[PDB]
Write an enzyme that holds these catalytic residues in place. Structure first.
Site, mmCIF file in Angstrom:
data_model
loop_
_atom_site.group_PDB
_atom_site.id
_atom_site.type_symbol
_atom_site.label_atom_id
_atom_site.label_comp_id
_atom_site.label_asym_id
_atom_site.label_seq_id
_atom_site.Cartn_x
_atom_site.Cartn_y
_atom_site.Cartn_z
ATOM 1 N N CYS A 151 0.774 -1.241 0.000
ATOM 2 C CA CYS A 151 0.000 0.000 0.000
ATOM 3 C C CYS A 151 0.813 1.303 0.000
ATOM 4 O O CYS A 151 0.328 2.344 -0.486
ATOM 5 C CB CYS A 151 -0.990 -0.023 1.149
ATOM 6 S SG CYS A 151 -2.375 -1.087 0.789
ATOM 7 N N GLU A 169 7.156 -2.513 6.631
ATOM 8 C CA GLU A 169 6.911 -2.608 8.078
ATOM 9 C C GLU A 169 5.422 -2.785 8.453
ATOM 10 O O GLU A 169 4.920 -2.151 9.407
ATOM 11 C CB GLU A 169 7.469 -1.362 8.773
ATOM 12 C CG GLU A 169 6.716 -0.028 8.435
ATOM 13 C CD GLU A 169 7.279 0.711 7.223
ATOM 14 O OE1 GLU A 169 7.951 0.065 6.416
ATOM 15 O OE2 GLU A 169 7.063 1.939 7.071
ATOM 16 N N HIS A 185 10.814 0.425 12.505
ATOM 17 C CA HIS A 185 9.568 1.063 12.078
ATOM 18 C C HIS A 185 8.420 0.840 13.057
ATOM 19 O O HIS A 185 7.441 1.581 13.010
ATOM 20 C CB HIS A 185 9.130 0.597 10.694
ATOM 21 C CG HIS A 185 9.699 1.402 9.567
ATOM 22 N ND1 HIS A 185 9.586 2.776 9.494
ATOM 23 C CD2 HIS A 185 10.356 1.018 8.446
ATOM 24 C CE1 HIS A 185 10.157 3.207 8.381
ATOM 25 N NE2 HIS A 185 10.631 2.158 7.728
ATOM 26 N N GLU A 230 11.677 7.576 7.547
ATOM 27 C CA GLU A 230 12.855 6.833 7.076
ATOM 28 C C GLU A 230 14.195 7.149 7.761
ATOM 29 O O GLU A 230 14.945 6.234 8.100
ATOM 30 C CB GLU A 230 12.962 6.947 5.534
ATOM 31 C CG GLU A 230 11.753 6.339 4.807
ATOM 32 C CD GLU A 230 11.423 4.948 5.290
ATOM 33 O OE1 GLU A 230 12.342 4.201 5.712
ATOM 34 O OE2 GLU A 230 10.250 4.573 5.266
ATOM 35 N N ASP A 284 5.881 7.331 -5.965
ATOM 36 C CA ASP A 284 6.658 6.188 -6.463
ATOM 37 C C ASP A 284 7.798 6.668 -7.341
ATOM 38 O O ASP A 284 8.852 6.035 -7.391
ATOM 39 C CB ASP A 284 5.779 5.197 -7.240
ATOM 40 C CG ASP A 284 4.871 4.389 -6.334
ATOM 41 O OD1 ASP A 284 5.174 4.307 -5.127
ATOM 42 O OD2 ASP A 284 3.849 3.843 -6.819
ATOM 43 N N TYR A 305 16.058 8.508 3.415
ATOM 44 C CA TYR A 305 16.828 7.582 4.270
ATOM 45 C C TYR A 305 18.159 8.188 4.677
ATOM 46 O O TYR A 305 18.472 8.293 5.874
ATOM 47 C CB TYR A 305 17.135 6.235 3.556
ATOM 48 C CG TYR A 305 15.913 5.468 3.131
ATOM 49 C CD1 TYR A 305 15.221 5.814 1.962
ATOM 50 C CD2 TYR A 305 15.436 4.415 3.899
ATOM 51 C CE1 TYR A 305 14.073 5.131 1.577
ATOM 52 C CE2 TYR A 305 14.298 3.702 3.503
ATOM 53 C CZ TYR A 305 13.622 4.074 2.341
ATOM 54 O OH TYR A 305 12.505 3.383 1.949
ATOM 55 N N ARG A 326 13.150 -6.831 -6.818
ATOM 56 C CA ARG A 326 13.415 -5.787 -5.821
ATOM 57 C C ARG A 326 13.887 -4.591 -6.606
ATOM 58 O O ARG A 326 14.913 -4.651 -7.289
ATOM 59 C CB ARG A 326 14.499 -6.230 -4.822
ATOM 60 C CG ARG A 326 14.709 -5.297 -3.614
ATOM 61 C CD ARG A 326 15.780 -5.914 -2.719
ATOM 62 N NE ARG A 326 16.141 -5.051 -1.604
ATOM 63 C CZ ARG A 326 17.039 -5.367 -0.673
ATOM 64 N NH1 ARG A 326 17.667 -6.540 -0.689
ATOM 65 N NH2 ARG A 326 17.320 -4.493 0.277
HETATM 66 ZN ZN LIG Z 1 11.839 2.184 5.941
#
Ligand SMILES: [Zn+2]
Ligand SMILES: CNCc1ccccc1-c1cccs1
Ligand SMILES: [Yb+3]
EC number: 3.3.2.6
Length: 606
Positions: free
Chosen positions: A132, A268, A296, A315, A372, A380, A560
């Site tokens: 999601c 998570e 998370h 993040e 996206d 991060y 991935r």
């Molecule tokens: Zn993360």
């Protein structure tokens, strides 16, 4: 306000609860059923409201046992189509009503990937999984698709009886379906208010093995044993995370290892972290991803970003905790090693995007940007670099960890902005405001490019990786003979990976050098996905044709996005593999994850 959502904002009405009752139809690739939303008005005299949807078919909307009027607006690209519901009776402030929506998903749902038996390990059964984050919950059910709203949920899920359903919730039993004996209904309860991006479902031929006092690992039978071993540090990491973050409030911490096309390292989902099977290195070497998903459970799932502009909050804090857990398990020098590696990854991202590119700001403006498309390492690593820098500014890890715990406590069950974080940082460190006032806030938070200040990093574990990488870069042909397998003797896999990351930063190397590396180091034989990834990238970028089929194979046998996207881009930019790369994408496209397919398509310009 949330520019990624078309729903009424939380200042208008709030979803408190979802009861989801649905059936998984594998023959049609649809989810069919009802989403009963318990909605609280935040306004006087509320008469209508708007929900997000995407590629949904609405059958009817029922309030107080009667159908009510609704309308779907025109589609707004990746945001989907807003659904306005006419309330049959004006609500006063804080009044709560139940709105029951009969809907069906489309086979093309951007939240879902449907797999044939052949795309699974068992080869006998199909498989469904959801994803999601960020704004794909609207492609499963009508909802306020914004992390500024938190709700509890319950669900009943009817699936073919030979299959197992799991969700991001506590399992609340199973029975045969009374309306169809070929089916089972699995039930689920999530007592902790969560943002809707944390709603998760999997249906497949799943088995489980217990690996700790509160952890089962789930996967197809072929992967169970290997998974139980790979993630056996899970309990230890949980205890450390509880020490750092405060109580784990979620009951169980289960792991689900997905089929290879799951688009991320992990996700998570509360009670049930999803992980890529590319973590299965045989040696636990990729376990930082577990530490990250565990983290998370505090940063992201308790304290949540109000909108996706503030994704770094989710993040960066998680990377920060992640690295502390790994540092606790393996030492403070290891923590610094990983921190510094992270900075290299930020250098890579900023170089890729361009130092002035909007997506390199810590806080971004996602108005008319698909999350996206904007997704990267930046939130991060720039997020982490900010925290590591503040840690050093404010008196070291013990002290900043005090802030992290207080920060989690303070904002539990809430959704917050960068200003909320910064305000609390100032409150917590009020005796250090002069120091805090030395930070160039506007730069760190709002400017593109590398951060204005680089933290200080212990170099102990990094030095050998740089030394080796420098040898290869500065080598001439007459130096190649001197390279030998013993060069790697005292390097851990992490160091092997950093060596390759270092070298990749200067690619291409001459073809002869790369051929020699294979001759002396046999990198073709390493199955560690991180290492093989970097190695194949270095080969393709250095124009080695032998590596083409190896790169195509990795790119497509797992999905991935971290690995698949840059392998395809590398292959596309190599003139010898360009046509095959495009052809391979076109052939796999329909059977790929819809998000991964869309982005690889953009990357390749096809
Ligand atoms: Zn993360
Ligand atoms: C055909 N009846 C089953 C069904 C249809 C549509 C939506 C939900 C359901 C469910 C039955 C049991 C759990 S969902
Ligand atoms: Yb020489």
């Amino acid at each position: 306000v949330d520019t990624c959502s078309l729903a009424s904002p939380a200042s208008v009405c709030r979803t408190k609860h979802l009861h989801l009752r649905c059936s998984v139809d594998f023959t049609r690739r649809t989810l069919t059923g009802t989403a009963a939303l318990t909605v609280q008005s935040q306004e006087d005299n509320l008469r209508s409201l708007v929900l997000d949807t995407k590629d949904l078919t609405i059958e009817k909307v029922v309030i107080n046992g009667q159908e009510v009027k609704y309308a779907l607006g025109e589609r707004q690209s990746y945001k989907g189509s807003p659904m306005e519901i006419s309330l049959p009776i004006a609500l006063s402030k804080n009044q709560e009503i139940v709105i029951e929506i009969s809907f069906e998903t489309s086979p093309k749902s951007s939240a879902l990937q449907w797999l044939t038996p052949e795309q699974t390990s068992g080869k006998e059964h199909p498989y469904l999984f959801s994803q999601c984050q960020a704004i794909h919950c609207r492609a499963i059910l009508p909802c306020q698709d914004t992390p500024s709203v938190k709700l509890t949920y319950t669900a009943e899920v009817s699936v073919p009886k030979e299959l197992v359903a799991l969700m991001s919730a506590i399992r609340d039993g199973e029975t045969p379906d009374p309306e169809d004996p070929s089916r089972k209904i699995y039930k689920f309860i999530q007592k902790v208010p969560i943002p809707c991006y944390l709603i998760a479902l999997v249906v497949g031929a799943l088995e489980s093995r217990q690996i700790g006092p509160r952890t089962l690992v789930w996967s197809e039978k072929e992967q169970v044993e290997k998974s139980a071993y790979e993630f056996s540090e899970t309990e230890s990491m949980l205890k450390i995370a509880e020490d750092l973050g405060g109580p784990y409030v979620w009951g169980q911490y289960d792991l689900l290892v997905l089929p290879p096309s799951f688009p991320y390292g992990g996700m998570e989902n509360p009670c049930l972290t999803f992980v890529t099977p590319t973590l299965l290195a045989g040696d636990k070497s990729l376990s930082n991803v577990i530490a990250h998903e565990i983290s998370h459970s505090w940063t992201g799932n308790l304290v949540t970003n109000k909108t996706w502009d503030h994704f770094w909050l989710n993040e960066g804090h998680t990377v920060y905790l992640e690295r502390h857990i790994c540092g606790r398990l393996f030492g403070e020098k290891f923590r610094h090693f990983n921190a510094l590696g992270g900075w290299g990854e930020l250098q890579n991202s900023v170089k890729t995007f361009g130092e002035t590119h909007p997506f390199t700001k810590l806080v971004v403006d996602l108005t008319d940007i698909d999350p996206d498309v904007a997704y990267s390492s930046v939130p991060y690593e720039k997020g982490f670099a900010l925290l590591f820098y503040l840690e050093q500014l404010l008196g070291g890890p013990e002290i900043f960890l005090g802030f992290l715990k207080a920060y989690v406590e303070k904002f539990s069950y809430k959704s917050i902005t960068t200003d909320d974080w910064k305000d609390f940082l100032y409150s917590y460190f009020k005796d250090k405001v002069d120091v805090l006032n030395q930070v160039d806030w506007n730069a760190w938070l709002y400017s593109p490019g590398l951060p204005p200040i680089k933290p200080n990093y212990d170099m102990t574990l990094t030095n050998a990786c740089i030394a080796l990488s420098q040898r290869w870069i500065t080598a001439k042909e007459d130096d190649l003979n001197s390279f030998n397998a013993t060069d790697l003797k005292d390097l851990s896999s992490h160091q092997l990976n950093e060596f390759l990351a270092q070298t990749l930063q200067r690619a291409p190397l001459p073809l002869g050098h790369i051929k020699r590396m294979q001759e002396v180091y046999n990198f073709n034989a390493i199955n560690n996905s991180e290492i093989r990834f970097r190695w194949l990238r270095l080969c393709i970028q250095s124009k080695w044709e032998d590596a083409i089929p190896l790169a195509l194979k990795m790119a497509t046998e797992q999905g991935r996005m971290k690995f698949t996207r840059p392998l395809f881009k590398d292959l596309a930019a190599f003139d010898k593999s360009h046509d095959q790369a495009v052809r391979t994408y076109q052939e796999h496209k329909a059977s790929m994850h819809p998000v991964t397919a869309m982005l690889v398509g953009k990357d390749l310009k096809v």
